[PDB]
Amino acid sequence: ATYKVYPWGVNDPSKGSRSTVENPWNLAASEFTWLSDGSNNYTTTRGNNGIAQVNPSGGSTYLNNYRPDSPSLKFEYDYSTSTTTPTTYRDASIAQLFYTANKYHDLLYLLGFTEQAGNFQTNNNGQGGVGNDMVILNAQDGSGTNNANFATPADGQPGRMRMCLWTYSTPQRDCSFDAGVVIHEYTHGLSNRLTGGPANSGCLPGGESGGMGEGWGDFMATAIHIQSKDTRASNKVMGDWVYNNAAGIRAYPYSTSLTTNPYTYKSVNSLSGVHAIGTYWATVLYEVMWNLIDKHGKNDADEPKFNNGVPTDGKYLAMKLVVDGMSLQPCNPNMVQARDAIIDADTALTKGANKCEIWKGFAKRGLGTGAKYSASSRTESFALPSGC
Ligand SMILES: *[C@@H]1O[C@H](CO)[C@@H](O[C@@H]2O[C@H](CO)[C@@H](O)[C@H](O)[C@H]2NC(C)=O)[C@H](O)[C@H]1NC(C)=O
Ligand SMILES: [Ca+2]
Ligand SMILES: [Ca+2]
Ligand SMILES: [Zn+2]
Secondary structure, three states, X not given: OEEEEOOOOOOOHHHOOOEEEEOOOOOOOOOOOOOEOOOOXXXXXXXXXXXXXXXXXXXXXXXXOOOOOOOOOEEOOOOOOOOOOHHHHHHHHHHHHHHXXXXXXXXXXXOOOOHHXXXXXXXXXXXXXXXXXXXXEEEOOOOOOOOEEEEOOOOOOOOEEEEOEEOOOOOOEEHHHOHHHHHHHHHHHHHHHHOOOOOOOOOOOOHHHHHHHHHHHHHHHHHHOOOOOOOOOOOEOOOXXXXXXXXXXXOOOXXXXXXXXXXXXXXXXXXXXXXXXXXXXXXHHHHHHHHXXXXXXXXXXOOOOEEOOEEOOHHHHHHHHHHHHHHHOOOOOOHHHHHHHHHHHHHHXXXXXXXXXXXXXXXXOOEOOOOEOOOOOOEOEOOOOOOO
8 A cells, every 4th residue: 555645754745745655554553554444444545543535515424525436555646736726636635634644643552542541443452442433534624714623522432633724825725734733633632532531521621721732732743843953942833834924823933942932831821712822831841852852862763762661762752751641630630730740650651760851841931849820820930849
């Protein structure tokens, strides 16, 4: 089986070129491949982890929406950034969306988002949790433009991703091809399933918890696209291609310079809406990640190496600690509790080997030892534990 796609690590069409990749699944995470659920084999963008289609109606059903009928298993379709009519590259759009989401399924699986952790699969093959909940992957969704979204029911009911056309450019830009946005949306399914465990999807409804909900997706997309040359001095934005602005969709770049990005926990008292709040959260995680990378290095490959169950590099270690923290934090968590869950995740995973790297990043942006949450009147702190 082949896919002609912008491969994993190329965020969007302005940053790379398409090529044909063969059998891109990781069999540890997709034992049936992406094209089977163990009982049925498919000749389209359908299998254990997801089903992809266009949804021009904007409706809530999916099985009978259009997807390419390709018994060749060569999911190689025409695409050009000059094309004005997005339906003429719907096959490519669907295939790219299927590719990116399945790759991310596989990576998250390796970081611990398995069947027993409440992940999204039709068949869990005796490994725990509840199946029948592959992701419904809607490309060119007619419910709107200039946005994307993800609905996460409890374990056993499929997640639903809606990817829309964006119309701040001519030609319009199809966000199926903006991997970071795909990753951001899928991460809503990750954080909603893990937080409060897989049966509770009401744990990140709004306010500060919902803000972290936005931040986690931006962080995961950012971390995945860190480049060989990058250092803590690199600044990163979100969605700059599909949105057609070099600033991306958030108010500041993800940066370790407090000049480039000034947000601290106190700033959240003045921020309005979950995306603004999440911009602060993703900046804190960015700080922590660079502390871990500066300590452990970074692995530019598409999957981590593990030493005694622990990612060997700071990039995937950061991702793993963030994922693990979601399983330890309370339902409806605030950022102080989510900080503590990440520290506790490191205690469990590494016996506390990264305590001070984590605290330094949180403290630097006001989530130090003295921080206190309030919906309107948070208290910030830049103080560190004595051990640090
Ligand atoms: C359904 O798809 C699976 C996965 O591609 C097929 O399993 C492969 O079978 C061949 C031999 O038939 C083996 O050499 C491969 O190692 C198998 N792959 C995996 C991942 O197990 C299976 O044959 C297909 N079923 C039908 C009826 O065509
Ligand atoms: Ca499941
Ligand atoms: Ca949950
Ligand atoms: Zn979001």
